Amino acid sequence: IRRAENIPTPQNPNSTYRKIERPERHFNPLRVPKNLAAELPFKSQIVQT
Amino acid sequence: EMETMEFLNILANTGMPGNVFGILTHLDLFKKPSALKDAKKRLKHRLW
Amino acid sequence: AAWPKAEDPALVQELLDCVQQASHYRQLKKGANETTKSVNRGTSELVILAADTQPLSIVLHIPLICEEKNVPYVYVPSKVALGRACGVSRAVIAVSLTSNEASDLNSKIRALRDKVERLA
Amino acid sequence: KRDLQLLRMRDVVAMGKQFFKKDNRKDFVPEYCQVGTIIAGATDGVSGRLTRKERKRTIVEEVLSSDSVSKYKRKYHEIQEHKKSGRKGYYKKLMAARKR
Amino acid sequence: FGGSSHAKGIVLEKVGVEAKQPNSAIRKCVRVQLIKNGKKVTAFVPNDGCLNFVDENDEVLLAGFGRDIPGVRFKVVKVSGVGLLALWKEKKEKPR
Amino acid sequence: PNRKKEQRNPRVKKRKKYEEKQKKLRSVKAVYKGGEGPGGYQGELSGIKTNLVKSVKL
Amino acid sequence: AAERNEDEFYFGMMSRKGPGSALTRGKGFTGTVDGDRGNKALSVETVRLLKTQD
Amino acid sequence: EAARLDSELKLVGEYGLRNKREVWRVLLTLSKIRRAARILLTLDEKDPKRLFEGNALIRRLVRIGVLDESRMKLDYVLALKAEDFLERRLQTLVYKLGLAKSIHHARVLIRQRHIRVGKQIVNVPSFMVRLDSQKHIDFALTSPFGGGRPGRVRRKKAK
RNA sequence: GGAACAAUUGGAGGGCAAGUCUGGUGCCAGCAGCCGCGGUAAUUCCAGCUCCAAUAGCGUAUAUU
Numbered sequence: 001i002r003r004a005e006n007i008p009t010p011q012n013p014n015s016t017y018r019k020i021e022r023p024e025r026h027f028n029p030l031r032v033p034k035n036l037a038a039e040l041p042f043k044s045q046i047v048q049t
Numbered sequence: 050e051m052e053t054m055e056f057l058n059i060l061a062n063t064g065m066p067g068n069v070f071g072i073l074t075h076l077d078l079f080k081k082p083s084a085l086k087d088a089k090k091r092l093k094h095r096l097w
Numbered sequence: 098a099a100w101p102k103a104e105d106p107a108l109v110q111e112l113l114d115c116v117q118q119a120s121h122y123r124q125l126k127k128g129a130n131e132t133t134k135s136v137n138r139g140t141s142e143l144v145i146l147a148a149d150t151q152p153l154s155i156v157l158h159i160p161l162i163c164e165e166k167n168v169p170y171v172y173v174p175s176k177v178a179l180g181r182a183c184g185v186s187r188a189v190i191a192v193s194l195t196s197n198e199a200s201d202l203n204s205k206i207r208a209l210r211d212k213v214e215r216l217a
Numbered sequence: 218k219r220d221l222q223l224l225r226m227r228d229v230v231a232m233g234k235q236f237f238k239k240d241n242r243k244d245f246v247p248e249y250c251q252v253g254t255i256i257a258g259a260t261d262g263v264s265g266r267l268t269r270k271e272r273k274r275t276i277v278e279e280v281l282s283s284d285s286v287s288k289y290k291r292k293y294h295e296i297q298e299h300k301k302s303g304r305k306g307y308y309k310k311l312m313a314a315r316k317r
Numbered sequence: 318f319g320g321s322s323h324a325k326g327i328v329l330e331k332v333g334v335e336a337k338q339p340n341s342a343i344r345k346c347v348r349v350q351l352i353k354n355g356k357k358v359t360a361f362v363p364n365d366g367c368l369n370f371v372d373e374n375d376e377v378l379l380a381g382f383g384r385d386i387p388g389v390r391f392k393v394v395k396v397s398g399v400g401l402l403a404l405w406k407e408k409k410e411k412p413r
Numbered sequence: 414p415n416r417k418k419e420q421r422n423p424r425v426k427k428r429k430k431y432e433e434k435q436k437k438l439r440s441v442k443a444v445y446k447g448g449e450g451p452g453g454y455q456g457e458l459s460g461i462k463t464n465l466v467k468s469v470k471l
Numbered sequence: 472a473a474e475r476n477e478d479e480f481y482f483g484m485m486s487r488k489g490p491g492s493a494l495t496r497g498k499g500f501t502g503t504v505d506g507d508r509g510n511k512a513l514s515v516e517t518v519r520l521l522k523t524q525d
Numbered sequence: 526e527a528a529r530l531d532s533e534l535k536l537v538g539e540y541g542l543r544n545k546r547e548v549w550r551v552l553l554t555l556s557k558i559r560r561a562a563r564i565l566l567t568l569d570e571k572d573p574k575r576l577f578e579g580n581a582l583i584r585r586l587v588r589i590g591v592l593d594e595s596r597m598k599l600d601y602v603l604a605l606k607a608e609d610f611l612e613r614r615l616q617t618l619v620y621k622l623g624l625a626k627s628i629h630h631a632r633v634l635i636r637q638r639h640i641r642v643g644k645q646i647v648n649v650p651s652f653m654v655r656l657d658s659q660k661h662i663d664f665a666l667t668s669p670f671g672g673g674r675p676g677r678v679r680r681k682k683a684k
Numbered sequence: 685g686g687a688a689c690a691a692u693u694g695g696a697g698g699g700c701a702a703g704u705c706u707g708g709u710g711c712c713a714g715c716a717g718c719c720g721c722g723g724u725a726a727u728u729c730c731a732g733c734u735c736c737a738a739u740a741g742c743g744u745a746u747a748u749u
Contacts, residue, residue: 015722023303037502038490040472042481048503058410065412139448208595238460261453322746337705380745415732421691424543431538
């Protein structure tokens with residue numbers, strides 16, 4: 001029917017399969033608030049230079 | 050032939066009847082009897 | 098000086114027989130320099146040196162490296178017969194047949210080297 | 218110390234053409250050593266000897282003067298890419314093309 | 318069973334036709350009635366696909382089954398005289 | 414299911430398993446592989462480990 | 472931080488530089504504590520010898 | 526058993542046979558001959574049956590040549606081995622002689638009819654070659670490496 | 685010249701979705717899965733996944749020994 005009535009078959013850019021790049025995720029470092037690094041006890045305070 | 054196998058599967062599907070028999074014909078259209086008997090053998094195995 | 102001289106009784110002929118076998122099996126190096134390089138590379142199974150050679154210092158210097166490597170070396174009294182037993186069209190004074198891991202010539206070498214080991 | 222670092226890494230020196238027994242302590246230093254040089258192989262003097270312009274003072278200088286420094290650079294920039302993969306410039310590009 | 322190595326039987330009902338897990342053995346089970354003794358037993362088919370081919374009241378050859386439901390001793394091997402495994406590899410058709 | 418060229422011709426299949434069994438053989442033990450090179454002696458070409466002992470205790 | 476005893480005393484406290492607070496450090500305050508990078512006040516004679524070399 | 530499997534795999538590797546079927550054929554024949562050797566040792570010395578059967582059999586075995594001519598004792602006939610038997614196998618003699626570059630190369634030559642023993646072409650690479658016949662192993666006159674026509678591919682690129 | 689002049693039979697394993705099903709003190713787990721949004725002249729996919737055995741013969745049932 002499509003070849004007769006000269007109709008292209010419907011084809012979706014959004015449905016045709018694709019080759020995905022997965023960039024290797026890393027995350028930000030741990031971020032800990034001002035008051036927390038204040039109030040915590042000596043043994044575990046953070047040492048920063 | 051395509052029609053032969055068509056018919057075969059139709060028979061098997063709507064129902065294998067009592068009896069079927071194969072007829073190899075046009076054997077006079079053969080130049081080498083060794084080729085002819087090899088054809089006989091292979092065809093029989095195909096049909097079995 | 099050539100005190101490891103071979104004797105007559107078919108010993109010499111067994112040597113030439115295995116020599117021709119090795120020339121056919123291509124497990125044979127030939128002539129003084131190639132014998133020298135084979136025993137330098139230590140690959141030689143056994144080494145046979147002529148005795149009728151014009152002055153014998155060649156087949157006297159070879160047993161030095163034969164005494165180093167400790168390979169059976171043996172004196173044969175006819176270099177022209179070595180040439181014929183190898184199939185050369187030239188007379189050879191020094192021959193060295195090496196070892197491979199898969200042959201019955203190897204068993205022949207084992208017997209021959211045991212005989213020359215009893216000899217010297 | 219650089220020399221010893223090189224020697225402990227003599228594995229990666231041969232770019233796959235020769236693997237060594239990975240003799241790795243944590244402390245790559247022997248408490249006793251001496252820096253030496255080969256004298257003379259009188260058997261082989263036509264190629265088994267370094268020319269004057271190749272007689273370098275130091276091991277790392279020798280491996281510098283050999284080839285495949287290009288190949289080193291090549292592999293290093295591969296790993297440079299592979300670790301610049303999705304770390305930070307990537308994310309900044311995303312947030313830029315989101316902000317626009 | 319009996320003394321034979323195989324048995325011919327009649328498909329009663331693919332009990333476990335209302336199954337949730339595909340490859341469960343109560344999906345793959347089927348009650349058959351072995352003919353000579355007229356006895357009801359149940360058997361396993363090796364695969365759910367072959368269970369789709371098998372229908373009722375077809376003669377079934379079956380045999381022993383030896384290696385979540387241990388105790389079913391038989392396994393169906395041929396139905397209507399055709400090899401289930403050949404159907405399953407799509408070699409032959411099934412005579413009906 | 415799909416089969417391969419080796420599983421198609423049984424002889425060449427039995428070729429390739431043997432070499433792969435021989436490459437792994439060197440990965441456990443050492444095989445003579447000919448003596449020193451004709452270029453001369455150039456060192457124990459892959460490492461030497463003084464804390465490595467392979468003597469079989471009787 | 473919750474189960475923190477208000478009253479502990481190690482000895483780094485006599486020897487380090489504390490967090491303090493918002494008011495203490497003021498604007499460069501992050502409650503982490505400073506680990507000296509490794510420099511120190513060079514007394515004169517050393518600086519002289521160095522500057523001589525320079 | 527892993528010893529059996531590693532053993533047979535090693536054998537086919539060093540002599541590129543076709544299958545363990547061929548291997549077990551060689552083994553079953555080794556079993557017959559070593560069994561006959563054992564019953565000949567079950568006879569005692571200077572028993573004329575033992576003397577005649579032993580000399581006849583060792584003559585057969587050095588005549589096919591798998592026994593070394595140096596030793597002629599039933600103990601060594603019992604100490605015979607399948608490595609020597611597949612060394613005796615035809616294709617391995619071809620590879621040892623050097624008419625082919627590899628063992629599979631030589632087997633292909635014996636399949637597509639390039640080598641002859643003495644007079645005649647032999648298609649089977651497992652032919653028992655005797656000590657008297659080990660010499661006359663050469664290319665066919667119809668083989669392009671022997672002479673005659675240049676060959677199929679030579680013809681097709683020469684066309 | 686392999687997409688062929690078209691090797692087979694068993695066994696074990698690994699990889700998977702805008703899919704399905706079931707269980708529960710949230711993301712976990714389980715079984716499973718040709719079924720997926722589109723699309724059949726479209727797709728070109730693990731591109732022919734891996735390994736063990738036998739190999740032009742082998743598997744399974746029962747009886748067994």
